[PDB]
Amino acid sequence: GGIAIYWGQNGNEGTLTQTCSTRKYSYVNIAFLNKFGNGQTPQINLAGHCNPAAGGCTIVSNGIRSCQIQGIKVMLSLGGGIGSYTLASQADAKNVADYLWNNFLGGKSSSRPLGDAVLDGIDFDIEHGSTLYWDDLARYLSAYSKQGKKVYLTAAPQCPFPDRYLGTALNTGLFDYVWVQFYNNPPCQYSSGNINNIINSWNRWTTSINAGKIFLGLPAAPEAAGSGYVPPDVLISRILPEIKKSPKYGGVMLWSKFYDDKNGYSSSILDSV
Ligand SMILES: CC(=O)N[C@H]1[C@H](O[C@H]2[C@@H](O)[C@@H](NC(C)=O)[C@H](O[C@H]3[C@H](O)[C@H]4N=C(N(C)C)O[C@H]4[C@@H]3CO)O[C@@H]2CO)O[C@H](CO)[C@@H](O)[C@H]1O
């Protein structure tokens, strides 16, 4: 399979263009559109990469195009660990979908935050807030595909199944790729010498939801997460040989570009994925 990487949350991790040029990644998720819903003006946060005011982040379209030209799919990730995002009603789900269509997808807007490039899809990293309406938001985004160009839908649920926030949305069967976060969650992550919890969880995910492909999401360095880091050798010798048996296996997902560079994680596992 391939590696999905998240980019955006550390100004020192390189440009989107550089990130794609590594040839290590097949999917790039831009993190994050962390404020939206409830009448708020949506706002993108890309840490020190750029300031979205006055079109300061439109420069990112150069990288988006550069990635796409190389066959890499680029998604805008909603949510994250920090943010006041939520959906207040089904109407809010519709307003948000329309805003996303016009500002990041095939629609039209005078103030597209990342410029004129058209992103491949939308990634859902909903970690707190409202548990309602994410399925409607997925439906409304998916309907825009009917205009001709596919809007990919991807999701980053946490490993305990089912996910309190994304369970219903994942049940719609609309998601193309689901990179489950097998960390920061004791009952379903790796712990020294024990791979049972992670495998058992992987089995639940791959047999329970209908999505195109499911990915094993991991922290790329011990600093990238509170818990659940898996040393490369253990992944390669014990985990991959098992999870690759599933026909739904798509690859591995890592948080994040910054930590991957520091720890050389994808460099170590690339050919085994
Ligand atoms: C306020 C804001 O939007 N951003 C902050 C930025 O917050 C980052 C960091 O706290 C990240 N922490 C680490 C260790 O990288 C944090 O990463 C979370 C992420 O939200 C979750 N989603 C995933 N996926 C795999 C999808 O994984 C987890 C990881 C933890 O593993 O994300 C927050 C933003 O949500 O912090 C910077 C630097 O301090 C600050 O400038 C500002 O940019």
- DSSP class per residue in 4-71: EEEESS-GGG--HHHHHHTS--SEEEEEEEEE-STTPPPEE--TTS---GGGTTTTHHHHHHHHHHTT
Identify the CA nearest to 169 among candidates 185, 157, 181: 157
Please indicate whether residue 225, judged by its CB atom, sits closer than 6 Å to ligand 1: yes
Residue 41 near residue 34, CB atoms below 8 Å: no
Residue 127 near residue 79, CB atoms below 8 Å: yes
Q: Record the resolution, in angstroms.
A: 1.9
Identify residue 196 by its one-letter amino acid code.
N
Q: How far apart are CA 7 and CA 54, in angstroms?
A: 22
Q: How far apart are CA 260 and CA 219, in angstroms?
A: 9
Give the DSSP H/E element, type plus range, for residue 252.
strand 249-255
Residue 245 near residue 207, CB atoms below 8 Å: no
Can you give the CATH number for the domain in which 194 is found?
A: 3.20.20.80
- DSSP class per residue in 66-114: HHHHTT-EEEEEEE-SS------SHHHHHHHHHHHHHHHSSS--TT-TT
**Structure token pair of residue 120:** 């491949």
Q: How far apart are CA 150 and CA 152, in angstroms?
A: 6
Domain with 200 in it: 1-273
Identify the CA nearest to 83 among candidates 49, 18, 38, 146: 38
How far apart are the CA of 9 and the centre of ligand 1, in A?
6
Please indicate whether residue 226, judged by its CB atom, sits closer than 6 Å to ligand 1: no
Number of C-beta neighbours around residue 17 at 10 A? 15
Domain count, the chain: 1
The secondary structure of residue 153, as a DSSP letter, is E
Q: Could you give the maximum distance between any two Cα atoms of the chain, in Å?
A: 54
| Helices within 189-256 (DSSP H only) | 196-208, 232-234, 240-243
Q: For a pocket test of ligand 1, which of 5, 7, 9 has the largest count of ligand atoms closer than 8 A to its C-beta?
A: 9
**Structure token pair of residue 176:** 């193309």
